[PDB]
């Protein structure tokens, strides 16, 4: 997942 | 005391669970796993937020685990540092  | 959750409302695992009512069908991680890792749904795409640190995560990947994505992006979270 990644940071927004 | 000395720490404070970014979202006191989502302090309850049950309340975090219910936020996933409209979790989209392409999102492979379960509301159970996400809520258990301190995460609730923001209502936008597959974007979730930690009640404790306020960190936000999206674009989940096959094989991602909520805890390990939580920990690796926000290692100094009190919820992360308080689990076992
Ligand atoms: Zn956190």
Short mmCIF file of N, CA and C and ligand atoms in Angstrom, two decimals:
data_model
loop_
_atom_site.label_atom_id
_atom_site.label_comp_id
_atom_site.label_asym_id
_atom_site.label_seq_id
_atom_site.Cartn_x
_atom_site.Cartn_y
_atom_site.Cartn_z
N UNK A 1 0.88 -1.18 0.00
CA UNK A 1 0.00 0.00 0.00
C UNK A 1 0.93 1.23 0.00
N UNK A 2 0.33 2.38 -0.30
CA UNK A 2 1.10 3.59 -0.36
C UNK A 2 0.44 4.70 0.44
N UNK A 3 1.26 5.64 0.87
CA UNK A 3 0.74 6.88 1.42
C UNK A 3 -0.01 7.69 0.40
N UNK A 4 -0.98 8.40 0.94
CA UNK A 4 -1.88 9.21 0.19
C UNK A 4 -1.22 10.54 -0.07
N UNK B 1 -3.74 11.96 29.17
CA UNK B 1 -2.30 11.58 29.38
C UNK B 1 -1.38 11.99 28.23
N UNK B 2 -0.34 11.20 27.97
CA UNK B 2 0.78 11.71 27.16
C UNK B 2 0.68 11.49 25.62
N UNK B 3 -0.28 10.67 25.23
CA UNK B 3 -0.60 10.38 23.82
C UNK B 3 -2.08 10.62 23.60
N UNK B 4 -2.51 10.76 22.35
CA UNK B 4 -3.90 11.08 22.10
C UNK B 4 -4.27 10.58 20.69
N UNK B 5 -5.38 9.83 20.52
CA UNK B 5 -5.66 9.38 19.17
C UNK B 5 -6.10 10.52 18.29
N UNK B 6 -5.59 10.51 17.08
CA UNK B 6 -6.08 11.39 16.05
C UNK B 6 -7.62 11.31 15.93
N UNK B 7 -8.24 10.13 15.98
CA UNK B 7 -9.73 10.02 15.89
C UNK B 7 -10.34 9.19 17.01
N UNK B 8 -10.73 9.85 18.10
CA UNK B 8 -11.25 9.18 19.28
C UNK B 8 -12.48 8.37 19.01
N UNK B 9 -13.26 8.80 18.04
CA UNK B 9 -14.49 8.09 17.60
C UNK B 9 -14.19 6.66 17.16
N UNK B 10 -13.12 6.51 16.39
CA UNK B 10 -12.77 5.20 15.83
C UNK B 10 -11.86 4.35 16.70
N UNK B 11 -11.83 4.71 17.96
CA UNK B 11 -11.10 4.04 19.03
C UNK B 11 -11.61 2.60 19.21
N UNK B 12 -12.90 2.42 19.00
CA UNK B 12 -13.53 1.12 19.13
C UNK B 12 -13.37 0.30 17.83
N UNK B 13 -12.92 -0.94 18.00
CA UNK B 13 -12.74 -1.83 16.85
C UNK B 13 -14.06 -2.02 16.14
N UNK B 14 -15.15 -2.12 16.91
CA UNK B 14 -16.49 -2.24 16.31
C UNK B 14 -16.85 -1.05 15.40
N UNK B 15 -16.57 0.15 15.86
CA UNK B 15 -16.82 1.33 15.10
C UNK B 15 -15.95 1.37 13.86
N UNK B 16 -14.69 0.95 13.96
CA UNK B 16 -13.84 0.88 12.77
C UNK B 16 -14.42 -0.12 11.77
N UNK B 17 -14.84 -1.28 12.24
CA UNK B 17 -15.49 -2.26 11.39
C UNK B 17 -16.65 -1.69 10.61
N UNK B 18 -17.58 -1.01 11.30
CA UNK B 18 -18.78 -0.49 10.61
C UNK B 18 -18.47 0.54 9.53
N UNK B 19 -17.37 1.31 9.69
CA UNK B 19 -16.95 2.27 8.64
C UNK B 19 -16.75 1.61 7.26
N UNK B 20 -16.60 0.28 7.20
CA UNK B 20 -16.34 -0.45 5.95
C UNK B 20 -17.63 -0.87 5.20
N UNK B 21 -18.77 -0.33 5.61
CA UNK B 21 -20.07 -0.59 4.98
C UNK B 21 -19.99 -0.52 3.45
N UNK B 22 -19.38 0.56 2.95
CA UNK B 22 -19.28 0.74 1.50
C UNK B 22 -17.84 0.53 0.96
N UNK B 23 -17.00 -0.25 1.69
CA UNK B 23 -15.71 -0.78 1.18
C UNK B 23 -15.93 -1.37 -0.23
N UNK B 24 -15.20 -0.90 -1.27
CA UNK B 24 -15.45 -1.33 -2.62
C UNK B 24 -15.03 -2.75 -2.85
N UNK B 25 -15.68 -3.36 -3.81
CA UNK B 25 -15.60 -4.76 -4.09
C UNK B 25 -14.28 -5.16 -4.73
N UNK B 26 -13.52 -4.20 -5.29
CA UNK B 26 -12.18 -4.51 -5.81
C UNK B 26 -11.13 -4.54 -4.67
N UNK B 27 -11.50 -4.12 -3.47
CA UNK B 27 -10.53 -4.01 -2.42
C UNK B 27 -10.43 -5.38 -1.72
N UNK B 28 -9.27 -6.05 -1.87
CA UNK B 28 -9.17 -7.45 -1.45
C UNK B 28 -9.02 -7.63 0.04
N UNK B 29 -8.43 -6.66 0.76
CA UNK B 29 -8.28 -6.85 2.22
C UNK B 29 -9.65 -6.78 2.92
N UNK B 30 -9.78 -7.56 3.99
CA UNK B 30 -11.05 -7.64 4.73
C UNK B 30 -11.12 -6.51 5.74
N UNK B 31 -12.32 -5.93 5.92
CA UNK B 31 -12.62 -5.07 6.99
C UNK B 31 -12.18 -5.62 8.35
N UNK B 32 -12.33 -6.91 8.54
CA UNK B 32 -11.84 -7.55 9.79
C UNK B 32 -10.35 -7.33 10.03
N UNK B 33 -9.55 -7.68 9.05
CA UNK B 33 -8.11 -7.47 9.18
C UNK B 33 -7.73 -5.99 9.33
N UNK B 34 -8.34 -5.11 8.53
CA UNK B 34 -8.02 -3.68 8.57
C UNK B 34 -8.36 -3.03 9.90
N UNK B 35 -9.58 -3.28 10.39
CA UNK B 35 -10.05 -2.75 11.67
C UNK B 35 -9.24 -3.27 12.83
N UNK B 36 -8.86 -4.52 12.75
CA UNK B 36 -8.01 -5.06 13.78
C UNK B 36 -6.65 -4.41 13.82
N UNK B 37 -6.19 -3.88 12.68
CA UNK B 37 -4.89 -3.16 12.66
C UNK B 37 -5.02 -1.65 12.98
N UNK B 38 -6.18 -1.21 13.44
CA UNK B 38 -6.33 0.20 13.86
C UNK B 38 -6.88 1.06 12.72
N UNK B 39 -7.21 0.44 11.58
CA UNK B 39 -7.62 1.18 10.37
C UNK B 39 -9.13 1.23 10.19
N UNK B 40 -9.61 2.37 9.74
CA UNK B 40 -11.01 2.48 9.31
C UNK B 40 -11.07 3.15 7.91
N UNK B 41 -12.20 2.98 7.23
CA UNK B 41 -12.42 3.48 5.86
C UNK B 41 -12.69 4.96 5.83
N UNK B 42 -12.02 5.68 4.95
CA UNK B 42 -12.27 7.13 4.79
C UNK B 42 -13.51 7.44 3.93
N UNK B 43 -14.05 6.43 3.29
CA UNK B 43 -15.13 6.61 2.34
C UNK B 43 -14.66 6.94 0.94
N UNK B 44 -13.34 7.04 0.68
CA UNK B 44 -12.78 7.41 -0.64
C UNK B 44 -11.90 6.23 -1.16
N UNK B 45 -12.23 5.67 -2.35
CA UNK B 45 -11.46 4.56 -2.99
C UNK B 45 -11.16 3.39 -2.03
N UNK B 46 -9.91 3.01 -1.90
CA UNK B 46 -9.54 1.97 -0.94
C UNK B 46 -8.65 2.59 0.14
N UNK B 47 -8.93 3.86 0.47
CA UNK B 47 -8.14 4.61 1.38
C UNK B 47 -8.64 4.43 2.83
N UNK B 48 -7.73 4.00 3.68
CA UNK B 48 -8.02 3.82 5.12
C UNK B 48 -7.17 4.74 6.02
N UNK B 49 -7.61 4.89 7.27
CA UNK B 49 -6.90 5.74 8.21
C UNK B 49 -6.77 5.08 9.54
N UNK B 50 -5.62 5.31 10.17
CA UNK B 50 -5.38 4.84 11.54
C UNK B 50 -6.02 5.80 12.55
N UNK B 51 -6.84 5.26 13.45
CA UNK B 51 -7.44 6.08 14.51
C UNK B 51 -6.41 6.72 15.44
N UNK B 52 -5.25 6.08 15.57
CA UNK B 52 -4.29 6.36 16.62
C UNK B 52 -3.34 7.40 16.09
N UNK B 53 -2.57 7.01 15.08
CA UNK B 53 -1.60 7.94 14.47
C UNK B 53 -2.17 8.91 13.43
N UNK B 54 -3.29 8.53 12.78
CA UNK B 54 -3.90 9.33 11.71
C UNK B 54 -3.27 9.05 10.36
N UNK B 55 -2.39 8.07 10.31
CA UNK B 55 -1.77 7.79 9.05
C UNK B 55 -2.80 7.26 8.09
N UNK B 56 -2.56 7.49 6.80
CA UNK B 56 -3.46 7.07 5.74
C UNK B 56 -2.77 6.25 4.68
N UNK B 57 -3.49 5.24 4.18
CA UNK B 57 -2.92 4.31 3.22
C UNK B 57 -3.93 4.00 2.15
N UNK B 58 -3.45 3.77 0.92
CA UNK B 58 -4.34 3.41 -0.22
C UNK B 58 -3.57 2.51 -1.17
N UNK B 59 -4.25 2.13 -2.25
CA UNK B 59 -3.69 1.35 -3.32
C UNK B 59 -3.06 0.09 -2.73
N UNK B 60 -3.88 -0.68 -2.04
CA UNK B 60 -3.42 -1.92 -1.45
C UNK B 60 -2.99 -2.90 -2.58
N UNK B 61 -2.07 -3.78 -2.26
CA UNK B 61 -1.31 -4.57 -3.22
C UNK B 61 -1.57 -6.02 -2.86
N UNK B 62 -1.59 -6.95 -3.86
CA UNK B 62 -1.77 -8.36 -3.52
C UNK B 62 -0.66 -8.80 -2.54
N UNK B 63 -1.05 -9.47 -1.45
CA UNK B 63 -0.06 -9.92 -0.47
C UNK B 63 0.23 -8.92 0.62
N UNK B 64 -0.43 -7.76 0.60
CA UNK B 64 -0.21 -6.73 1.64
C UNK B 64 -0.98 -7.27 2.83
N UNK B 65 -0.44 -7.02 4.01
CA UNK B 65 -1.10 -7.27 5.26
C UNK B 65 -1.35 -5.90 5.92
N UNK B 66 -2.48 -5.70 6.57
CA UNK B 66 -2.73 -4.38 7.22
C UNK B 66 -1.72 -4.01 8.29
N UNK B 67 -1.38 -4.97 9.14
CA UNK B 67 -0.43 -4.66 10.18
C UNK B 67 0.93 -4.22 9.63
N UNK B 68 1.44 -4.95 8.63
CA UNK B 68 2.80 -4.73 8.19
C UNK B 68 2.87 -3.47 7.35
N UNK B 69 1.83 -3.19 6.58
CA UNK B 69 1.76 -1.88 5.90
C UNK B 69 1.62 -0.70 6.85
N UNK B 70 0.80 -0.87 7.90
CA UNK B 70 0.68 0.09 9.00
C UNK B 70 2.05 0.39 9.66
N UNK B 71 2.71 -0.68 10.08
CA UNK B 71 3.97 -0.61 10.79
C UNK B 71 5.10 -0.04 9.93
N UNK B 72 5.18 -0.49 8.70
CA UNK B 72 6.30 -0.06 7.86
C UNK B 72 6.17 1.41 7.39
N UNK B 73 4.96 1.91 7.27
CA UNK B 73 4.74 3.31 6.90
C UNK B 73 4.72 4.24 8.10
N UNK B 74 4.13 3.78 9.20
CA UNK B 74 4.00 4.58 10.45
C UNK B 74 4.53 3.81 11.67
N UNK B 75 5.85 3.56 11.72
CA UNK B 75 6.47 2.75 12.79
C UNK B 75 6.41 3.24 14.27
N UNK B 76 6.16 4.53 14.42
CA UNK B 76 6.19 5.20 15.69
C UNK B 76 4.77 5.42 16.18
N UNK B 77 3.77 4.76 15.54
CA UNK B 77 2.39 4.78 15.99
C UNK B 77 2.21 4.07 17.35
N UNK B 78 1.46 4.68 18.26
CA UNK B 78 1.28 4.07 19.59
C UNK B 78 0.51 2.76 19.51
N UNK B 79 -0.35 2.64 18.51
CA UNK B 79 -1.09 1.40 18.33
C UNK B 79 -0.21 0.25 17.84
N UNK B 80 0.58 0.55 16.82
CA UNK B 80 1.66 -0.30 16.35
C UNK B 80 2.61 -0.66 17.47
N UNK B 81 3.06 0.33 18.26
CA UNK B 81 4.04 0.06 19.31
C UNK B 81 3.43 -0.56 20.56
N UNK B 82 2.10 -0.68 20.59
CA UNK B 82 1.40 -1.22 21.73
C UNK B 82 0.87 -2.62 21.53
N UNK B 83 0.94 -3.16 20.31
CA UNK B 83 0.44 -4.53 20.01
C UNK B 83 1.40 -5.68 20.44
N UNK B 84 1.16 -6.94 20.06
CA UNK B 84 1.99 -8.04 20.61
C UNK B 84 2.09 -9.32 19.80
ZN1 LIG C 1 -1.28 4.23 13.36
#
